[PDB]
Amino acid sequence: RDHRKIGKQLDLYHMQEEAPGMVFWHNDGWTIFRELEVFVRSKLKEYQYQEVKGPFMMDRVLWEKTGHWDNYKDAMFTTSSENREYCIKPMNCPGHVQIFNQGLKSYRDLPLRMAEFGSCHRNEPSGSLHGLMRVRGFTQDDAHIFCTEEQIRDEVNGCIRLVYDMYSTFGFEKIVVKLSTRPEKRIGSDEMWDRAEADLAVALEENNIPFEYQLGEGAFYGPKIEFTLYDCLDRAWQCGTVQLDFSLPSRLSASYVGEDNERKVPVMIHRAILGSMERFIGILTEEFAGFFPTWLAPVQVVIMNITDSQSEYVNELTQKLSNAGIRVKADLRNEKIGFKIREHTLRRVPYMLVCGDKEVESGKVAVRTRRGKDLGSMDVNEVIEKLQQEIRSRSLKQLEE
Amino acid sequence: RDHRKIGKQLDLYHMQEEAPGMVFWHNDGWTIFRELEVFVRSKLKEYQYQEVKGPFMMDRVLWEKTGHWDNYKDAMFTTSSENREYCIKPMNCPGHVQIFNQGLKSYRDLPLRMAEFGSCHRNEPSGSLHGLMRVRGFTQDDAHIFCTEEQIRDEVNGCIRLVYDMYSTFGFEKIVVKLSTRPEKRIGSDEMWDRAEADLAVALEENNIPFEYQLGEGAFYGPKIEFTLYDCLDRAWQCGTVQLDFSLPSRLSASYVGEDNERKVPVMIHRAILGSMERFIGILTEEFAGFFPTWLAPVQVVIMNITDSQSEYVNELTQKLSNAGIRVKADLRNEKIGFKIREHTLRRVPYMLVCGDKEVESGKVAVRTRRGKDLGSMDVNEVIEKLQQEIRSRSLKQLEE
Ligand SMILES: C[C@@H]1C[C@H](C)C[C@H](C)[C@@H](O)CC(=O)O[C@H]([C@@H]2CCC[C@H]2C(=O)O)C/C=C/C=C(\C#N)[C@H](O)[C@@H](C)C1
Ligand SMILES: C[C@@H]1C[C@H](C)C[C@H](C)[C@@H](O)CC(=O)O[C@H]([C@@H]2CCC[C@H]2C(=O)O)C/C=C/C=C(\C#N)[C@H](O)[C@@H](C)C1
Ligand SMILES: [Zn+2]
Ligand SMILES: [Zn+2]
């Protein structure tokens, strides 16, 4: 269960010294990534998030305003144009605030949930870089919630439900949660922190989640909730976070018109479920030992011919399944059937369909799996039905599992 | 007819001086972008392209070997880590070759068509920066085809068909193709050039396209054809290109095992249809003067009510249309109905569904368009079917005509 070895065996990705900590996504790994993107977007539509795109770099003055220049300085890449210095974005938050600042905002626009798949580049020490898990470039599932003080609790709640939904989808039911509270010195009033902390704690309690306090471990800009999933090996992976920010909105001059027609500064919530999506792909790759659920599988079905006599037929089927929204390849190569079966078994292809003369005559397909289960001769439309159902339900288990 | 004014009016995007030439995509504009992306991906599936993702930056040595350091130096952003120089990629081609170089290749792996939506950063003089059309950051619809000299003609044919298909989708049927031939000094033998040029010419006239010749205007690394579409104002936009490259594979050491069991260097084809996708979004914004075909429209349907009495009903409908894959908003505020219709008409929302008491009792909707047409009372499911068809087909035209 090493995501790098499995990564090479399935031709998911590769890395080079000319770009340390930056992934080359091959077709299949990128298919996995894009499927993750699809799932996340379904969740964004369900939980009602906007999806935006921020610029890759912004000038140094912005990053000084946000405080990244004081705190994040070593971790940022800098480039320059026309005697102006720019940092490549380590985070998507300031850009999101810049978007929020366009147009007048009122209380009616709140809560405003703004999501992006962030392309972030942090310059990490090269000695710390490991696989997909510790990288210089990465893509965050990143959202920011602009709300009022009264809307905090509910929004945190929605974030919690989102976390558990999304995690249970991949089969992680074991989640340890940590609430980090105020340090000795902080931005924001004692009252603001009391409200925020009470909101987090109470939300977690109402969702029936046992959690542990980490005292003084909260950032100076706000209290937070962190989510650690456990894999099938009982290894701990910290992914999800809900973080309050009392710093960013005032520094970037975010404001809205309240009910009283008075200028208010919105509360900000950083929320991420998977965190780094590259890293999450590493984690999934190791959890699944290379066998991905059908919806996550780069190639879902491979259709093979015994001889050239089946070729036409195979092609025919390959179109049909392709038009059904299934990811399917045909192996027409001149090879023995066992060669193909072996090759596609090592590739962890969920479904191998075999066409001999029997299938050409009958209008059926011989169905077998990567687990060595023979499902036997099946009607094509039946196969398409079951595959489509398995894909739409994002099931962890195959037919007859 | 200014994509900047229309962009501001429709809340599509904005730009700042902290990121010159770099777009902040708001929710709506990003929705347009995502629809473009989806369409292109449909064409990638149809024309059988891989989709990959390359790294954002790479070592300066790489860009020296590609020839960018000599030719592209002023256009590239440079950043550094641990006493090593990296360039942010102006182009996606070297990364694609790097991916290609992973694993042994044979002729049986060819043609290999590799696509990406490239995030490319070139450093353009700030004074030449205009809107979405001239930008520092951009996303290219980019592909590279690795093939044998024998497959060149077929691949160019495929690219041509792709170009005309995609352009036809957006309503540009007026296209001028220009074939740029060999410069006095060039990379590659006169034979390679005779064959490539003849392949471009013959593919073009196989497609019945009266191409114009540009003599000696080709690059030193290969011959090309370029595609210029004309809009409704009959102004020319050069977008697509098919560009042969003899320089890149040799410089980057790409090779495959021939059918003769000998070492072969793959022929490389750079191909793009839209070119910059931001720029193409601008061009489309001006072409449609803000009225995006329903498939491209950020908000496809706005369901509105007369009084509170219809609110519930409206909500139902909204959810329904949201469940049918339609992008739909509910306008519940207390305002004149005409107020709402005018506001959403100026927002270029394709369809406005008006619900009064009669619609509630009859289970229907009163259908209106941004063009000012009254489509009358309609069955809800009928509207859903027609909208779904209009979207699936990517029709340039709305209902009732
Ligand atoms: C410039 C400051 C850097 C900060 C002190 C770095 C710490 C190590 C830590 O606080 C980072 C953090 O938890 O950010 C977390 C993010 C969320 C997902 C994972 C983590 C992530 O992206 O790593 C969210 C907070 C962002 C905070 C800001 C912004 N923007 C603040 O306004 C600003 C004061 C941050
Ligand atoms: C480093 C060299 C720069 C070249 C001299 C710049 C010229 C102005 C022009 O030839 C660029 C060009 O046509 O690139 C075109 C692209 C395609 C879409 C529009 C254009 C685009 O991206 O702008 C593709 C060519 C890429 C070529 C290489 C690469 N990699 C070559 O191996 C290498 C020798 C190019
Ligand atoms: Zn953030
Ligand atoms: Zn290229």
Residue numbers in the entry:
A (entry chain B), B (entry chain A): 242 to 642
What did the original publication write about this model?
ThrRS is one of the 20 (in general) aminoacyl-tRNA synthetases (AARSs) that are essential enzymes responsible for charging corresponding amino acids to their cognate tRNAs and providing the correct substrates for high-fidelity protein synthesis. We determined the crystal structures of both human and E. coli ThrRS in complex with BN, and identified a unique structural inhibition mechanism of BN against ThrRS. BN occupies a significant fraction of the total volume of the ThrRS enzymatic pocket, physically excluding all three of the physiological substrates of ThrRS, namely L-threonine (L-Thr), ATP and tRNA. Although occupying the canonical active site cavity, BN also extends into a fourth ‘orthogonal’ pocket.
